Design a protein around this ligand. Sequence first.
Ligand SMILES: NS(=O)(=O)Nc1ccc(S(N)(=O)=O)cc1
Ligand SMILES: NS(=O)(=O)Nc1ccc(S(N)(=O)=O)cc1
Ligand SMILES: NS(=O)(=O)Nc1ccc(S(N)(=O)=O)cc1
Ligand SMILES: [Zn+2]
Length: 257
Amino acid sequence: HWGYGKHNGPEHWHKDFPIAKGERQSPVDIDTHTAKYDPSLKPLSVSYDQATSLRILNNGHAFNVEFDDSQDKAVLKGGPLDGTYRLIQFHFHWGSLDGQGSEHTVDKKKYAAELHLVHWNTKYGDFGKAVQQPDGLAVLGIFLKVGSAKPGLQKVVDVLDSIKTKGKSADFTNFDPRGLLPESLDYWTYPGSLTTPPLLECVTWIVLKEPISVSSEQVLKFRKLNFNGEGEPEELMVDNWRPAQPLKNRQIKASFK
Ligand SMILES: NS(=O)(=O)Nc1ccc(S(N)(=O)=O)cc1
Ligand SMILES: NS(=O)(=O)Nc1ccc(S(N)(=O)=O)cc1
Ligand SMILES: NS(=O)(=O)Nc1ccc(S(N)(=O)=O)cc1
Ligand SMILES: [Zn+2]
């Protein structure tokens, strides 16, 4: 069905998911000069010391590293968030070339890729119930640029050959997501949505200002994945990003001055 091709890409999504033209859609361009420092923001807290990864899956749109979220582990709190949000999975969006790939942009600049660490508000019980609330999710977005290799990303890169096609999964335990974070937690935040259908508007976006560096070799392996399932014509999993959407009645807040 929906995808990133000419006949099922972002421009077509609204037909089956009308919210695609909603009032708080993501991603968006982050105009750094218009963004305003917000003193009401509390310190951001990323506590992944107890994170328990379980599996990695090629879902035909990207690959998800899934976590066991049945217990109070790997949580995000503070910042613009009220309460605790639990990590359920992370994935990336990337391009066919280093010059594009990210969903959010900074002053219209597109990064090579973008990491999304997905969390759900614990007050709602689980992910399913959370996506029915305006503040059900919190996604920590991190930009990727091509340069030095990111050591903490290699284990992910080396398992991709086992989940080349749609529907394939593989055991992926003991992966520490702390190895994917930049040094600084400075960020921009705004109310948005999921960037892929169903495009639900339940996300508080927290996009870090400092990008992490990954090597050309690492991202090239991302590009070897397939959108298609085994035995079908090969279509490389590249450019699986949605372009910036209208900001509409929203303001982007900065955690730094
Ligand atoms: N969300 S959407 O992009 O409109 N969904 C969609 C778009 C195109 C087709 S198809 N394969 O052309 O019939 C099927 C589903
Ligand atoms: N809830 S869990 O079984 O521990 N883990 C889990 C992790 C990820 C997803 S999903 N399908 O990515 O939303 C669903 C469940
Ligand atoms: N695929 S889903 O079950 O709706 N969950 C989901 C989770 C996160 C995002 S995103 N790209 O981080 O906005 C999009 C969809
Ligand atoms: Zn995403």
